[PDB]
Structure formats: C-alpha cells, structure tokens
Design a protein around this ligand. Sequence first.
Ligand code: NHW
Ligand code: 4XB
Ligand code: CL
Ligand code: MG
Length: 385
Amino acid sequence: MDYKFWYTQPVPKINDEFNESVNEPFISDNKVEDVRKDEYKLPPGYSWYVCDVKDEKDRSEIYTLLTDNYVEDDDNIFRFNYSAEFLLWALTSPNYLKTWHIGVKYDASNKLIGFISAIPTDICIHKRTIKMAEVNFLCVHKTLRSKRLAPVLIKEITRRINLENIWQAIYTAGVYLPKPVSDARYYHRSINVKKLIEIGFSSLNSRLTMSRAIKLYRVEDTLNIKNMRLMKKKDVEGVHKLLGSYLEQFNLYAVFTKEEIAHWFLPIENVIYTYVNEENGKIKDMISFYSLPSQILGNDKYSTLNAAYSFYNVTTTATFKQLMQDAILLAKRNNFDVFNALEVMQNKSVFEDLKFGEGDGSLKYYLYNWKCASFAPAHVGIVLL
Ligand SMILES: CCCCCCCCCCCCCC(=O)CSCCNC(=O)CCNC(=O)[C@H](O)C(C)(C)COP(=O)(O)OP(=O)(O)OC[C@H]1O[C@@H](n2cnc3c(N)ncnc32)[C@H](O)[C@@H]1OP(=O)(O)O
Ligand SMILES: COc1cccc(COC(=O)c2oc3cccc(OC4CCNCC4)c3c2C)c1
Ligand SMILES: [Cl-]
Ligand SMILES: [Mg+2]
C-alpha cells in the first residue's frame, strides 16, 4: 500500500533486498542520553497507564481488552483468546521490565482501550547475538480503529526500549508490512474432527463423510517414546543443553539462559506443556506446546476452540515424525481440539504424513532496526506467542 508510518522507521523499504553478507543495524551508534524522556502525545482524553501484570486486576483488564479486541481470522468467525494466566507467563519472563507493559486508558470511563508490550530476549540473527525486545499483544479497541493510535503505541514502546539501550526488536504479524525477514505458513492438525467441522474450522467433501473424517484423524493412544513425561525443575540443565545445541543451526533464534529455560518450559496447566525423555539422567528428547484458545464468534453450541500451538520440539532418539506424532498425542491427552504449527525449523517435513492441513494465511517475521538477507522459514528457529 503506502506505509506512511513505516516508511519513517528504521526498517527496509518494500523493494529492499539484501545480500546474505549484510547483517547490521539500519542506525548504529545510538545514544541513551539522546532519547526522548517525554511520553508520546495521545489524543485529547486519553492517558498512558503502567500495567502491573502481577496485579490480578490490571492483568484482568488487559485480558478483557484482548478478549474483545484482539486478532481474528480472515472471516471474523474466531478471535484469539489468550488467558490471563497465559498473559502472566508471557509478560513476566526473566528480567522483564514493568514499564514495557504499556496501557492507554480513556479518561472519562477509566477503561483500558489500548495495549502494547515487550520483553527482553537475546536474539541470534545470522550468527550475531543482539539484545532485543520481543513485541507482542499490540491491541487497540475496535471502536477506535484507523485513528492512527497504533503508531503512538509503537513509538512510545520504542522510546521505552531505547531508554534501556536496546535498539532492535523482533515481532510477528499476519499482515504484510515493511518488510518480512521470513514468512511462515501455518498448518492445523485436527484432533476433535466433528467439533472442528461443526464450528466451520474444517470441512467435509463427498469423498469424506463424517465417519471417514473421524477415522482419518484417529490416533493410537500409545507414545512412540514411551518415557515422555512432564518436565520438572530437575530437567532445566538438560533441556537448556538439548534445546540450546539444536537451535544453533538456524538463522534466527533466541539464546536462552537456564533461567529462561525454566520460565519458558516448566509446565503450567492450560498455558505451557513440556515433555522430556530422560535416559541415564540426560534429557534426550523434548516436546512443547502452548495453549491458545480461540473464541468462537456466534456458534450456538461452542464458545471456545481448545487449541495447542507447537513450541519447541527436539529428538535425538526417534525420527522427527515420531516426535511430532507423540506431540499430537500429548495434545490430545490434554483435551485440545487441534494442534497448530508453523513451517519453521523441521516442521514442514512432517505435515503431510501427520495429516496437517494447510491454513489460510501466513505469519510474517520482522526485525526493527536490522538489515539482513531474508530467508525461507525452515531457517527460522524462534516461535513467538
Ligand atoms: C528497538 C525497539 C523497537 C520497538 C518497536 C518495534 C516495532 C513493533 C511493531 C508492532 C508489532 C506488533 C506485534 C503484535 O502484537 C502481533 S501482531 C497482532 C496485532 N494485533 C492485532 O492484529 C489485533 C487487532 N487489531 C488491532 O488492535 C489494530 O488493528 C492494531 C492495533 C493492530 C492497528 O491499529 P489500527 O487502528 O488498525 O491502525 P492505526 O492505529 O490507524 O495505525 C495504522 C498504522 O499501524 C500499522 N499497523 C497495523 N497493524 C500493525 C501490526 N500488527 N504491526 C505493526 N504495525 C501495524 C499500519 O500498517 C499503519 O502504518 P502504515 O501507515 O505505515 O502502514
Ligand atoms: C482459529 O482461530 C483464529 C483466530 C485468529 C486468527 C486466526 C488465523 O490465524 C491462524 O490460524 C494461525 O495459526 C497459527 C499456527 C501457529 C502459529 C500462529 O501464529 C503465532 C501464534 C499466535 N499469535 C501470533 C504468532 C498461528 C496463527 C496466527 C485463527
Ligand atoms: Cl513523532
Ligand atoms: Mg487507531
């Protein structure tokens, strides 16, 4: 389109394409002492608000904002419905800053109508490891859309991040903006087939009757890796090493510390599931997925789609296909209707054999203030939430 906000930002032009050997900021040499110390102006009757995610009430108000106003599917039949407990997990990682959790309230009602967040994470992009901010959960109330509020939120978080002497960020969106480093399609592996058909997430063709669709997706309730168990505190060193060593091969991935591994993977009911296979006290395989339910808009029978999203999966003792079959099965065991993944890492390789369907769109990966060659998604080794 025209991208009049994005064009003033340190990000590539729509027509920019860089050699593999390019790996550097757009703007280097930045200075904390020069960063604006004043908050971005909001329109009359609107105020900044510092959200304390560890306060139940503040967390609940972010949760209602996103519940009613967050990302929908193209046909406006489903809306992402991140739980409050998920938000807590997502936003309170190691060394997080409360003042990168940014709310906008409407003066007169005192109601939260806008939100944007970031967490600090070490990102390796093309073998350069950079302190970055991972930005998520940008949201403006449906009644206030197209008012140019989203650039005010962006600019204000950029200012807040810059104050910490961080100059790059990482983010994903479904919408095309200037300009993806990678673009990954999503795929859906049906578990509760009939519910999926009923709510219009999946469809039948005459070759596929209801009974046939149900047989097609039926799994065996027996793991390929018999000893796969919920991760415990004792497993953090092992997971750190297994995941840490695996991720080195990709062009884009998070460099997790131990403290990060514990946060990111220790299980929490209805938010994050990690399973491990220990052999001789060494952690040899792992599976992880997170819970992201979709609210079903206007379906008489169901109000929630229970969905599991693939997180980080590593196998040394089985085929990746066997690993990801077990991950489908562990998801089913925890009541999920569907197992979603992106075509990142080695995922695409198993999608056909494990009966994933292609979805309807793709997820773009972005860096802010970084110049580098774009790449196919199989070179992406990071999953954002
Ligand atoms: C070094 C530190 C750096 C930190 C900062 C890093 C950057 C982080 C960037 C944030 C990454 C967030 C990642 C994330 O959370 C994950 S992606 C999901 C974002 N949330 C949703 O899609 C929920 C529903 N929609 C809304 O809330 C509104 O439509 C939002 C708020 C999306 C835009 O509100 P609006 O009422 O529809 O629009 P205006 O206010 O009038 O603004 C229009 C301007 O916003 C640009 N826009 C629209 N959607 C965008 C998006 N998803 N990313 C970036 N930019 C987006 C748009 O292109 C236009 O700029 P342009 O004229 O150049 O084209
Ligand atoms: C059925 O429910 C919905 C609700 C809203 C939108 C859509 C359409 O996008 C997908 O159906 C969709 O499927 C995916 C599978 C893996 C990872 C994905 O993106 C991540 C995780 C979610 N937040 C941002 C980064 C996705 C998405 C966005 C489907
Ligand atoms: Cl400005
Ligand atoms: Mg707006």
